[PDB]
């Protein structure tokens, strides 16, 4: 019986700038469980039919975790751009996976703001697939060098979601899992 | 869902003075620079001060250096103008704003406020 | 009575580019970044174009800049007819303070 308990009912999700990865293997990974659950606000399969995967098979499945904008959720796909897509978290144009969300404005947002979870606004360039990158080197956004300090022209990189109870729906947290799949298979249904 | 609400939309007598208020909500305060707008009426949008985060470096456009000043409050999430000596060149609406990222400064940036007309 | 130069007004047919252009000295454009606002009368200025030719979110593609020495412009393509708003640039001077442009008004 594969963890997804440990997965999708946790009690903490990263940042999207710093978006954690956890390997399923070994164990028996139900999927028709999650899908035909209402708690989820969507439920966006790539590659394979949502439907079918209870009678898939795979070798490793690879379970990414983030909290996000829900107006960003859409960023979260295989051909998409955009400030999360390009400097946070990318998906490859050939992913196969499911990527499931659902609102938390019940658990992550409290009153006066809940900035614990950041999101890289500043990077030299967009990274590749996959890649994670958690410096906190100061951005130099023009000619003149930063040195290391924040001053003129030079910012550190990351921002703070201002999440409240009383946030317009694209403003609300959305907690995001991301169900990569991919010899021999240890992970069935 | 960054939101700046100004205060102190008041007619002043031509020589008095005036103290505007920018209460701020939906994103760090305290990490952040601002800066202050003014639209005359009828015209484009001018510069008037930004106040670094912890007050290291303060800066006026030399229309209003030596008369007018700014200064924040990080624990109450306001920022502040006190105007002194007004002229009636000064009429505009004012707007608050913030800078793009945390530490660093430049110019205005992406949340600005609806702003309050003054006028002299 | 300004320092950074921009055209008054500016003007095209929905389906067409057209640009806007912003000019300076040494100190305004040359050396430092470029921004650029969208003012729709009525409401607050928002930020269209940041250090140059980057994006905010919220700003799509039909929207990008460029600099070149000491000039800079904005161009605006597939216009629409809710983009009938005044554009500003602005640049950073040294021994001035934060520069505004004079404003460029674009209608359709």
């Known amino acids: 019986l594969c963890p997804f308990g440990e997965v999708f009912n946790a009690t903490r999700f990263a940042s999207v700038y710093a978006w954690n990865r956890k390997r399923i293997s070994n164990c028996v990974a139900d999927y028709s469980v999650l899908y035909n659950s209402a708690s989820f606000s969507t439920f966006k399969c790539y590659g394979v039919s949502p439907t079918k995967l209870n009678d898939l098979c795979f070798t490793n499945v690879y379970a990414d975790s983030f909290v996000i904008r829900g107006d960003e959720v859409r960023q979260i796909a295989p051909g998409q751009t955009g400030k999360i897509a390009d400097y946070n978290y990318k998906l490859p144009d050939d992913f196969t996976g499911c990527v499931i969300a659902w609102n938390s404005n019940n658990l992550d947002s409290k009153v006066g703001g809940n900035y614990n979870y950041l999101y890289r606004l500043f990077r030299k360039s967009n990274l590749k697939p996959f890649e994670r990158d958690i410096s906190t080197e100061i951005y130099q956004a023009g000619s003149t060098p930063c040195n290391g300090v924040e001053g003129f022209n030079c910012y550190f990189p990351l921002q703070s979601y201002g999440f409240q109870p009383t946030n317009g729906v694209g403003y609300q947290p959305y907690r995001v899992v991301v169900l990569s799949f991919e010899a021999p298979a240890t992970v069935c249904g | 869902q960054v939101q700046l609400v100004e205060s102190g939309g008041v007619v002043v007598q031509p020589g008095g003075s005036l103290r505007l208020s920018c209460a701020a909500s939906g994103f760090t305060f305290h990490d952040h620079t601002m800066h202050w707008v003014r639209q005359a009426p009828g015209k484009g949008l001018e510069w008037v001060s930004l106040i670094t985060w912890n007050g290291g470096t303060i800066h006026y456009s030399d229309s209003v250096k030596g008369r007018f000043t700014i200064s924040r409050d990080n624990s109450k999430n306001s920022l502040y103008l006190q105007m002194n000596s007004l002229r009636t060149e000064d009429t505009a609406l004012y707007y608050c704003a913030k800078d793009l990222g945390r530490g660093g400064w430049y110019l205005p940036s992406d949340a600005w406020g609806q702003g309050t007309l003054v006028t002299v | 009575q300004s320092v950074l130069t921009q055209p008054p007004s500016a003007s095209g047919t929905p389906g067409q580019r057209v640009t806007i252009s912003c000019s300076g000295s040494?100190?305004?454009?040359?050396?430092?970044?470029v921004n650029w606002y969208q003012h729709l009368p009525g409401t607050a200025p928002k930020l269209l174009i940041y250090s140059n030719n980057q994006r905010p979110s919220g700003v799509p593609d039909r929207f990008s800049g460029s600099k070149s020495g000491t000039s800079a412009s904005l161009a605006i393509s597939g216009l629409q007819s809710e983009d009938e708003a005044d554009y500003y640039c602005?640049?950073?001077?040294?021994?001035?303070?934060?520069?505004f442009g004079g404003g460029t008004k674009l209608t359709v």
């Open positions: 040494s100190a305004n454009i040359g050396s430092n970044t």
């Open positions: 602005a640049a950073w001077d040294d021994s001035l303070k934060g520069v």
